Design a protein around this ligand. Structure first.
Ligand SMILES: O=C(O)CCc1ccc2c(ccc3cc(C(=O)N4CCN[C@@H](C(=O)O)[C@H]4C(=O)O)ccc32)c1
Lengths: 279, 277
């Protein structure tokens, strides 16, 4: 029917958290049914659909939208990729499921950019993000545009800062601050966890990464020793948005519902519930 | 083709200065040495040509170049952003919202807040500026923020307000749990942000609730004024268009690209960001 929507999502705590069905064969508590096509091994396309239970910040948004926009859904986790890249002229991830009409919309920590907006429509952003900076509490830097980053050699001792390679942040820095990117290569980290350790252990002065992620890690940092820059100094500001098919008849109602949630304070409630920590 | 742009005086996003005697705008450069791009904007001072420049004017010029359209800029006649009001049985919008819906303008290029109430009738672009609401006070006034008892239990002793017919007016109108605060504010709301800011310096107004992109700028220039409580609400500015506009898609794509390539960073540094006192 026209009112039952296929919706794709991506496991990414705390925005989307996946659990096993409890014992019954149903999802309880604050979770919703979501299926996953689990591969047989890493060298095959064969697999099996498995019933899971999904919960989180983005799931509660989906529950709010389903109730307000008045639609039902079948939620499933993407398997080919993560959020979405254009690999060999083909979109994978959550973007691909929408572009190739396998999903009506995609819910998750999906950053709005110009590249993706050409193949999918994005809703209004429900969470602000961008390129931010995290330092040990006390260190003085503005945003990415600080001269201490653009020209690290102009200062003594020069700042030691990096990111996680092959991500959106490095791709932006490579295009906008070429020398900063060249300087960062010898300071890049395996992941977020190894970056925060480098900041605490004095091996790294600044970590440059997604704004929403850095803010979430800062609010639950043990000892509250890591802090992010103010929102006014975030570079290339954007947001997490819900992707839809181009010309979708649902985008108008989704936008009004999302803007209502921001105005209602329901969005703040979800941020306090899922994203705010103890710092 | 030839779009009728409507805007509003709101530093640092839009500056309004008189023309010179010969009817042109004086050549001027920023503190950093970049040329100040000024366009002729008509409006009330009867209608008179004036000079407009700023963050939003730089944005308009970038949009007109990217999508290749011409424009003429005028200032909104009533001087308001836009709220929806009952007509002495129907409803109508005032301010820039009203001029967009009436055809007096084809595109709103201003620090125009994106909200549900306006989005029901017009198309907003993706945000070209992320910010929020904060409180401005005279340096020495002590309030925690939007939850201060002098704001949540108002009286004639501590006067706070916002701008009439604006998004903040909508924000306090829609929430029934804010009706106590709104009932105080509607007795004191000002016609424009500039008059409200001036009233705080004159100690005629004790707290001004407004956009943080504007309030923090005013605090950086006028050291007798400070902000407090920080962002209790988060909102963004977007380009305003009618739902039938053929420029909708490319305006948002252009704004997204301008964020990604550092163009918005240039505007934010040139106009919005200044050193604290
Ligand atoms: O503490 C824990 O349990 C885990 C703590 C923890 C660490 C890392 C993460 C998250 C959450 C989300 C996330 C998303 C990206 C991520 O790929 N992008 C940013 C969102 N947007 C993604 C995209 O749209 O492509 C992408 C990006 O824009 O670069 C990277 C790391 C984390 C949580």
């Amino acid at each position: 029917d026209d009112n039952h929507l296929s919706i794709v999502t991506l496991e990414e705590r705390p925005f989307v958290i996946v659990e096993d069905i409890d014992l019954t064969e149903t999802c309880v508590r604050n979770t919703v049914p979501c299926r996953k096509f689990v591969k047989i091994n890493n060298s095959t396309n064969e697999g099996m659909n498995v019933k899971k239970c999904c919960k989180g910040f983005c799931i509660d948004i989906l529950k709010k939208l389903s109730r307000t926009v008045k639609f039902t859904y079948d939620l499933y986790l993407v398997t080919n990729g993560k959020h979405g890249k254009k690999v060999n002229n083909v979109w994978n991830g959550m973007i691909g499921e929408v572009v190739y009409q396998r999903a009506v919309m995609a819910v998750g920590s999906l950053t709005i950019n110009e590249e993706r907006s050409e193949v999918v429509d994005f809703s209004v952003p429900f969470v602000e993000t961008g390129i931010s900076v995290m330092v040990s509490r006390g260190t003085q830097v503005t945003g990415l545009s600080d001269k201490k980053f653009q020209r690290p050699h102009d200062y003594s001792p020069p700042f030691r800062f990096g990111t996680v390679p092959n991500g959106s942040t490095e791709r932006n820095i490579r295009n906008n601050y070429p020398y900063m990117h060249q300087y960062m290569t010898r300071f890049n980290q395996r992941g977020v966890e190894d970056a925060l350790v480098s900041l605490k252990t004095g091996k790294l002065d600044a970590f440059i990464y997604d704004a929403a992620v850095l803010n979430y890690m800062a609010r639950k940092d043990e000892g509250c020793k890591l802090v992010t820059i103010g929102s006014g100094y975030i570079f290339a500001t954007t947001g997490y948005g819900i992707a839809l098919q181009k010309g979708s008849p649902w985008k108008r109602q989704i936008d009004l519902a999302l803007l209502q949630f921001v105005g209602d304070g329901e969005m703040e409630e979800l941020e306090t519930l899922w994203l705010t920590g103890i710092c | 083709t030839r779009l009728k742009i409507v805007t509003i005086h709101q530093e640092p996003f839009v500056y309004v200065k008189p023309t010179m005697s010969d009817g042109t705008c004086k050549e001027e450069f920023t503190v950093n040495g970049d040329p100040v791009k000024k366009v002729i904007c008509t409006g009330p001072n009867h209608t008179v040509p004036q000079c407009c420049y700023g963050f939003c004017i730089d944005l308009l010029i970038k949009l007109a170049r990217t999508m290749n359209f011409t424009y003429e800029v005028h200032l909104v006649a009533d001087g308001k952003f836009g709220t929806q009001e009952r007509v002495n049985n129907k409803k109508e919008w005032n301010g820039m919202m009203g001029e967009l819906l009436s055809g007096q303008a084809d595109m709103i290029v201003a620090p125009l807040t994106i909200n549900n109430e306006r989005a029901q009738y017009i198309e907003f672009s993706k945000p070209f500026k992320y910010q929020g609401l904060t409180i401005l006070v005279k340096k020495g006034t002590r309030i925690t923020g939007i939850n201060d008892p002098r704001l949540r239990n108002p009286s004639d002793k501590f006067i706070y307000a916002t701008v009439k017919q604006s998004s903040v007016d909508i924000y306090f109108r829609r929430q029934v749990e804010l009706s106590t605060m709104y009932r105080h504010m509607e007795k004191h709301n000002y016609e424009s942000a500039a008059e409200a800011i001036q009233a705080v310096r004159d100690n005629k107004l004790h707290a001004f609730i407004w956009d943080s992109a504007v309030l923090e700028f005013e605090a950086s220039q006028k050291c007798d004024l400070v902000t407090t409580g920080e962002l209790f609400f988060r909102s963004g500015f977007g380009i305003g268009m009618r739902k039938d506009s053929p420029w909708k898609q490319n305006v948002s794509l252009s704004i997204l690209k301008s964020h990604e390539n550092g163009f918005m960073e240039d505007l934010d540094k040139t106009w919005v960001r200044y050193q604290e006192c």
